[PDB]
Ligand binder design. Sequence first.
Ligand code: ADP
Ligand code: ADP
Ligand code: MG
Ligand code: MG
Length: 514
Amino acid sequence: EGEVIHRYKVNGFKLFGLPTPKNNTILGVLGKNGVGKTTVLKILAGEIIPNFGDPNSKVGKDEVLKRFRGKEIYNYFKELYSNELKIVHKIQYVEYASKFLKGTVNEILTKIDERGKKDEVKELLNMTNLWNKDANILSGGGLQRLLVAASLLREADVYIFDQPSSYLDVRERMNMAKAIRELLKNKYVIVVDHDLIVLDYLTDLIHIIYGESSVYGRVSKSYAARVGINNFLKGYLPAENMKIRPDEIKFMLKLKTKMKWTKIIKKLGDFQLVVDNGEAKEGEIIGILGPNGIGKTTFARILVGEITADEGSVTPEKQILSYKPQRIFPNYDGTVQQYLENASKDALSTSSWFFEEVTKRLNLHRLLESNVNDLSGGELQKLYIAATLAKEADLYVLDQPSSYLDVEERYIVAKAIKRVTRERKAVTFIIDHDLSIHDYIADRIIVFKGEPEKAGLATSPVTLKTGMNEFLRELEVTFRRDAETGRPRVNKIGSYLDRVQKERGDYYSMVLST
Ligand SMILES: Nc1ncnc2c1ncn2[C@@H]1O[C@H](COP(=O)(O)OP(=O)(O)O)[C@@H](O)[C@H]1O
Ligand SMILES: Nc1ncnc2c1ncn2[C@@H]1O[C@H](COP(=O)(O)OP(=O)(O)O)[C@@H](O)[C@H]1O
Ligand SMILES: [Mg+2]
Ligand SMILES: [Mg+2]
């Protein structure tokens, strides 16, 4: 019911509504995958002409303008279609935007530097490492930084960023958010992202897109950024009168050592890793965070006996472990069902707590006939997370499980990790680059500091407060608690609370409504 903006094919996905871009404003778009976020951006960018639900018909620009006349969006579209707007679009699929890239990072950026901001962006996005590398040879994260950089250098009216936090480490995400905020004043900016802290930093306004993945999406009205993210956490949109999730994502709610490790040293070629002694309690979640190339995965690999430490040990030396590696690939002949059944009797019995909380809530129950090699990154991720979690263990290690996940699935996963760990009185280490995930479920954290590729030093497990304080300080940002949802809120650099908390040394504030 309502007015269809676009439909790709008969009986296919349909989109209802569009957000209006606003000048001198950063507009966030948020929702689970498969609901039309990328479609919305491509419409806004002028790459797709809305067909108003008829994929047979070739709608012209004139027709689109007649259909919008009187409405909020008309004027944007008039300017778009009358070629009065220069549009920059940092596309979602960065790996596809790679095979048309000739030359080094420096020379690509030098070619397109229209705003004389090359050197500025180099600094802001910390690109000196990438500087004389071939665009062709770049990893996910280097490509993402190169395209975001390239977008910042362009002189344009509208800048569109589809998921710029993908492949970025915790530090890079924050730098990218600072860079966009700083360099794109007095422009139309639209951003889609699944990292809530990135969105919170970047956005003035927020639209939620909700619906059923691959069936339909509807765009909410514009909310003030803070409110929009809060309604998303509550899972309720007041204006639309819409329960978009049956439960809420709540922050800040309310003995024996199961394992202990000495100082751990590991040298790999050039890179030296040092990890401080520590211990973990039964039921406890230790988040691990730090930039990439710093030894987090090496540390994971030491804990699972894949790599031997050069000095130091973990007691007890042999325990039942369950491991979700960072690098995920289809390595199995059989179905999702066969793979899950192999892992646990629980995982697929409609009878257990697991099936409904994890399996079903991950929507893995819909992929049972699929064989593992058919699955997308997102689906393999959930499959490996679910399998890992279904196994009865003393120790769980999950490496970057939020990669490939949308904004909903990461919190469903987060919740599950907590549930399994506490249920089974186990230790869980989770490495992740989404800071809200840590805030949401980590009981203590380990911070990795140093120089990517050369040296990493990791602290013992400390309180979120103790670790975040030191981590945020280096990163030069301050966090407070939102009054309504208790979610972390990042003070925009320069802001009222930002310089005061900075003087106090209170970078990670546990105070409500700061
Ligand atoms: N060219 C297309 N033809 C048919 N279906 C498409 C096409 N492009 C996207 N879709 C579908 O529309 C839905 C919404 O996709 P998209 O806008 O990319 O979602 P999101 O960005 O929110 O993940 C998904 O079903 C997607 O596969
Ligand atoms: N087997 C290895 N041999 C030599 N160097 C390695 C090996 N495995 C990882 N490295 C290097 O060690 C550093 C630490 O990597 P890793 O533990 O993968 O970091 P993170 O998970 O923090 O990104 C990286 O620079 C990586 O290239
Ligand atoms: Mg998309
Ligand atoms: Mg890693």
